[PDB]
Subunit: 290 residues, 4 copies
């Protein structure tokens, strides 16, 4: 029942990640105590902790129309795109972020392929963080007594093929043909296998995290209502795509890898299909055939 | 930023509820720190806290094959049927319980209509308890610093009609005709209205709680795989049926109210459809017509 | 085991007290996790939370040589003198503050008699706050789960006469004659009564708080080493003098009430003798006779 | 801001220490929430956690007149003497314990020299445990979020000579000549050095812990009122004597080392003088000369 603690590592980058985690700790504490007000607070904590890291030059927030430029005093090398509070019914909500090195708004419009670090936090019974700096995915638990994030699994790997599919089937009347076919195959396998189970929390970080630890596939594809999908490329899709690919998974828009999409605006939406590679590949077969 | 605290109330009954809440506080703390081991612990905490309340005579636990009879020393008037830990991916899991007055195992086999109190706890970012002693539903938050449950809403009422439907559609190939028709109507409304949204966490307490605070309908109906449904009558369906009806909702097996089912065994399963009354009533129309 | 919470009250004044409590909550959390660094942090939290209350115009901090003037944007009516962190061996350390209405540094140099509110926090096993706005002393416990201060006793009253005396007797060779005589009487009562017990934590807030709840007397009188005493008039002696007098006690320098001392500098020291009135009065008799 | 955790170690002995720590965690939580009732609870937690370790055969508690014999079912090799709750004014109170290997009550009446492990917990702003299994003293912090004790210093060593003396000088009129002389020398050094500072919290664990981390001397010697001292040999003096000696200090009754006293009853009191060795040695010189 006794432990020793040791500091864990994965320059300006380290200070920036510490400050993003420090904001996550504060948001966790606010969420536990608890809408519009939480969104504002969360945004303030992220922006201000990130700015006073002295590591940032440009931020993009889900909450702010335009990119935020760091005061010249505090400027550093990195660009951060984040969703401070993504997602009341205690459904686990989250924080999502991706970090780039600078190249103006320009700097925030890079291919996901250029990511240097990314992560998400999920505010559940425990506050969990998944993080990658390009050498796999590590999972951490917030210890709010220490004020520190504890490593709980190294180099998380997603299953090659899962048995869960996850999307809002309430949009069935708007689905494109490939989504309709794929869903039909999950429920009516044509190969003598059992149907997949269905899960959809309706909070992206919750659904993506389940997909990472249990395997399967998560989808918010384009539909007649949302022709470009709903989820946001810079600070939702790209970060989770990076995490999922670093765990051995795939993430696609249907027509290309999410991380290869060249962004055309900071609040651009894209379709998102991700998870176990054999599952995503099966979805991709339905696309190409339609 | 300053508060005063006041004790809240809804004899042996009060001691019993205090001890069930005390077990819930301990389980919350165990869950936050975290499978089979948790199930065992949770069960131990409930049984032992309940037994030393000196208010119980018979317990039924999801975890135990036979009913547990309280030592004659500690015996009181009440019977408690509970699921100590219902539901790893931080999906909110829960504890469910219903309390009866005695009439042997016999005493645990009463109609839901005979319930004196019931509740559930959901272990999310916060640990929430819904409770009723027959005069409506009250919602409480665990304050683990005080070690006490704080009232956060009195007399919770569910919406007459919602816009969410919640079931595992991965069982579509096993659905009975009425379930197939109902799902089809939610996705393809024949009245010019928008489709319902779909949500399914796959943890009953999470799905039921969302249904109470946002409205809509939750279903685990009979299907070819599970001809009697999956969820357990004594300590899952009856307790949540009691809560939901006390909030102005309905809960049915498809052929009768859950609380009117006369149990034939302690671990008996029944189909469960519950939520907003107009939604459940619509489901019932699909049944009667098939 | 169930509670209801109700907001408690004692305009700009209320916003200011909320922000001082909010800083106390943050300091509590920092202390629990834990020298020079804590002093700096504590100071930052107080100054910044107080400034963005929009209720302050001038601050005096134990940590800062000169008075801090609030930016004209954020200016309000009140003046706050505080010791952000007063007192490693887990000895309970504290935060002390007094609030005045403005009249420049001038505004911080008022008689204690002019205080509008004052308090201290003690960071023990629990974080406790004593507070007065002039209508007695109220005691609060920090509930760090709610993020709120809970009332635990109204209108705290100190005993007329106690049985504890509290001072650093290691300074005996420097004591003035009246202190020597008084100490001698506590140990060698000339009236057939039992000796007083001795207690000295060596952290002022700990010693003062014990004196309030158990009764007796606390002293840091002048001595040959410290001819004006050690403790600071504006943000140690005056605040605790105000609290102690509001609980029915007395606080003196030996020659006059602490709250009547007209300050001659912001970091001025004064002797401090406080506690149960009959005890302080006995000390005062030793003074007048010498 | 990221950490890794590693299990720390110092057979039945390990299970016993885990269960004593588990009781300490529960007591910490009770203290934080808070007299006679706490004493009872604390005692229950220790006894029951210790008994179900399956490592004990005989317990002695400050709270119980006679030794407690473990049910033959649960019996193991070890004997535990403990003070479950030693020491309301937030003064840090504590838990003290010493562990022996068996030789009946007989087994609890061994010389301190026979101790296999001992420790104390102090319930402050943080809950700290000092522990030794005979290879020095290790200091741990309770992390109540993890439910685990974190190592914060290895092999703690007390200063050879300190500058604090700690005793209740309110007993001056009852002191024996050697105590009077020693106190006089601390206040009136005859060697041109400065007087010692005085500290006395009046809670033994608080005073002993300060003495370990800051150095100096702590005394509760015999006096006319308490001719055998006040503190209890088996579960106060012996445990802290063992800790203090393992940190390079000394602990004496005035006439012999505490750990060499052969106990004559389980609730026997002895005088206690402990701390920095040069300080204790100086006290011993005053004894021998009187
Ligand atoms: O209700 P819908 O259309 O299924 O939207 C769900 C999505 O909306 C969001 O809340 C918006 O980012 C995501 O968390 C989630 O994945
Ligand atoms: O995976 P399925 O068949 O949808 O089962 C989900 C149900 O199983 C349970 O875990 C068992 O009680 C419920 O919490 C939940 O509602
Ligand atoms: O060591 P000394 O001289 O007794 O000083 C103790 C005093 O010093 C302080 O730490 C300084 O404010 C007070 O908390 C305390 O009352
Ligand atoms: O009030 P006194 O005689 O100084 O007693 C203090 C002692 O009493 C105890 O509370 C009893 O164990 C100890 O914690 C402490 O050292």
């Amino acid at each position: 029942d006794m432990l020793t603690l040791t500091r864990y590592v994965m320059g300006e980058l380290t200070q920036l990640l510490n400050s993003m985690l420090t904001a996550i700790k504060a948001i966790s504490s606010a969420v536990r105590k608890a809408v519009k007000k939480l969104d504002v607070l969360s945004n303030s904590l992220v922006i201000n902790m990130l700015q006073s890291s002295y590591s940032t030059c440009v931020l993009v927030s889900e909450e702010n129309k335009d990119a935020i430029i760091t005061a010249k005093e505090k400027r550093g090398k990195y660009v951060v795109c984040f969703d401070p509070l993504d997602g009341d019914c205690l459904a686990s909500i989250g924080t999502i972020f991706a970090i780039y090195r600078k190249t103006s708004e320009k700097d925030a419009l890079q291919c996901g392929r250029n990511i240097v670090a990314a992560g998400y936090a999920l505010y559940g019974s425990a506050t969990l963080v998944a993080l990658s700096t390009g050498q796999g995915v590590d999972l951490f638990m917030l210890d709010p007594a220490l004020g520190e994030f504890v490593l709980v699994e190294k180099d998380v790997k997603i299953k090659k093929k899962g048995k869960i599919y996850s999307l809002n089937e309430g949009y069935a009347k708007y689905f494109d043909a490939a989504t309709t076919e794929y869903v039909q195959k999950k429920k009516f396998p044509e190969d003598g296998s059992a149907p997949y189970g269905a899960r959809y929390v309706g909070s992206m970080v919750a659904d993506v995290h389940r997909t990472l630890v249990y395997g399967g596939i998560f989808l918010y594809p384009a539909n007649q209502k949302s022709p470009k999908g709903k989820l946001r490329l810079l600070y939702e899709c790209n970060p989770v795509a990076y995490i999922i690919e670093q765990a051995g998974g795939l993430a696609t828009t249907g027509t290309q890898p999410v991380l290869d999409v060249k962004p055309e605006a900071i609040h651009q939406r894209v379709p998102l299909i991700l998870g176990s590679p054999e599952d995503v590949q099966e979805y991709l077969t339905c696309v190409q055939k339609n």
